[PDB]
Every structure is written in C-alpha cells, then in structure tokens.
C-alpha cells in the first residue's frame, strides 16, 4: 500500500539518523508507550548503547538488552549479561537471580555464531555453579524462616542477609546450615563445594538418616492430617531428594559405604517385614536410583 510506503519512508528517516541524542529520547518514549517489540527490531547501534547504559542501574532494562540479544540469536551475549547481573550489587531478589542464572545456563548451553566453544562452556560452568549455590541459599532461607527453633528477631536479620545476592558456601554452611543441623542441605553444600572428606560426608549421612527416622516415627506415633509414611519411606525420600539433586557424585554418595549404612539402618531400626515393609527396600532404593547392578552386588558380596 501507499499507506505502508509512507510508513517505511517515515521510519527510515528515524532509524538512519546520526543524532543519537534523538535516538535516546526516542527509545525512552517508545517504552512509555509500551512499544516493546519496536525497540528490539531496531538494528541501529545507538540502541545497544542506550540499553547497555540503562541495564547498569535498572534491572528491568537489562531485561530488554537480554531479550534484544536472544531474538537476534546472540545467546552467549545474553547469558553474559544475565550472569553478570546475578553477580551484581543491584537490588534483585534471590529468586530472580535463580531465574537469571537458570536462563543464563540455557543461553550458554547452545552454540552461538562467532563465540568459541571454550568461552561458551566457561560461562555455562560459572552460571551453573552459582545456580546450584543460589538454590541451596534459597532452600536454606525458606527452611530457616519456617524453623520454630529460631527467634523471630533473628529471622528478620537472616532474611535481609540471604534474600539478595548469593553468598559463599562458607557463610551458608557455618552461620546457618550446620548450626540448625540441616543435614540434608549440609550435604548439598559438600557436593556444590567439591568437599573432599570421606568420613564427615558419611557422618553427616548417618545423622541425616537418624533425624529422618525420628521425624517419621514421631509422626506415625501421632497419627498429623493424613496417615504418615513408615520411617524407611521418609528416609528413602530424603535420599532420592539428594540423589537427583546431587547427580550421583561419588564423593557425597559413596555406595561403597552408604549402602551398608542404609542396610544397617534397615536392621538396627527394624524397618522390615515386621511393619509390612519390603525386606529388600534398601536394594530396591539404590537400584531404582540409577546405581549399577554390578556395583550393588559387589557391595553385598
């Protein structure tokens, strides 16, 4: 149409101009009108400077710059901003930083034209690490706040410290996870920290099993809204939760030692046919978790 011609004639004057102070005032006005998809389509290089200079102090503008790159398929450049934004000093909630690192991990998982394979994985590894930590920090804060053992005065002091940037595993372990005797989250920290120590890893597994057995036996004794599960069932849940979440690392999930422990617990605490349980529930647990048959039989031997 000639209507469509006068449209293209008009937006060529605008997009081609060399006055970038005009472009900035134009991009600022496009947002105020909610014309989001318009900013993205612009191929001028004055838009990149505007969005980059605004991403530095506005989370919701760094959002578009990341959208700008991902519609153009510059996936690495987006994860590069999403990661550098989660590590920022900006006022961003922890659960948003979990999204950022989760998107960054995806955008840095696929090849992007021009950028190396090493720099692609160099960023995916960094983002994945932080996401694992941030998930611990989130699951930790969630449990600390709901912990009756903690004073309501301290809970506010924690929430301000945790609900924001991602802290070191050292800070998460000492001043919080280990004190509260959160044995399951202590193991996730060992895994996320590549913590080399066979004993303490095993000692923590023993405490995690016992504390789990207790919470389930107290429940069964009380029944408590629905019929609670028998002890080994809740213990089995707390291992599966680690197994999927650990991705079955040999350091914090050593079948060489842990399987005897679970089999020992199944005897010393009488989780067997007496209570209607499958006597081979320790074997059934590890096999279905992905442990090789050739190894399980090697341990029972």
């Amino acid at each position: 149409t000639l209507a469509a011609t006068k449209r293209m004639e008009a937006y060529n004057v605008v997009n081609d101009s060399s006055d970038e102070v005009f472009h900035f005032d134009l991009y600022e006005w496009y947002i105020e009108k909610g014309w989001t998809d318009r900013i993205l389509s612009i191929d001028s290089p004055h838009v990149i400077t505007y969005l980059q200079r605004l991403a530095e102090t506005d989370f919701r503008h760094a959002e578009l710059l990341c959208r700008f790159y991902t519609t153009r398929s510059r996936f690495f450049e987006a994860a590069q901003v999403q990661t550098n934004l989660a590590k920022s000093d900006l006022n961003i909630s922890l659960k948003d930083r979990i999204i950022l690192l989760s998107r960054a991990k995806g955008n840095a998982s696929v090849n992007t034209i021009g950028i190396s394979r090493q720099q692609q994985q160099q960023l995916n590894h960094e983002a994945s690490e932080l996401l694992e930590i941030a998930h611990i920090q989130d699951d930790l804060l969630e449990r600390l706040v709901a912990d009756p053992r903690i004073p309501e005065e301290r809970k506010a002091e924690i929430e301000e410290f945790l609900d924001g940037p991602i802290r070191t595993l050292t800070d998460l372990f000492n001043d919080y996870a280990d004190q509260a005797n959160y044995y399951d989250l202590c193991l996730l920290i060992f895994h996320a920290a590549d913590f080399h120590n066979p004993r303490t890893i095993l000692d923590t597994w023993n405490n995690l099993i016992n504390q789990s057995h207790f919470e389930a036996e107290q429940r069964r004794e009380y029944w408590p809204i629905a019929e609670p599960p028998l002890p080994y069932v809740y213990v089995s849940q707390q291992i599966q939760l680690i197994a999927h979440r650990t991705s079955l690392d040999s350091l914090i999930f050593p079948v060489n030692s842990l399987l005897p422990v679970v089999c020992a617990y199944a005897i010393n605490n009488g989780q067997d046919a007496s209570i209607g349980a499958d006597p081979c529930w320790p074997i059934q647990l590890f096999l279905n978790l992905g442990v090789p048959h050739a190894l399980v039989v090697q341990v029972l031997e």
Binding site: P151, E157, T168, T170, N174, Q179
Partner: peptide
C-alpha cells in the same frame, strides 16, 4: 571453596545486640 570454622560464629538461636 569451603572452609569450616566451628570456632567463632553467631548464635543462630539468640537475637542481636
């Protein structure tokens, strides 16, 4: 990088100041 230090912490079960 993890460093356990049971020595000096902050009592998780006591308010501040």
């Amino acid at each position: 990088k993890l460093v356990i230090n049971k020595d000096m912490r902050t009592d998780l079960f006591s308010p501040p100041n």
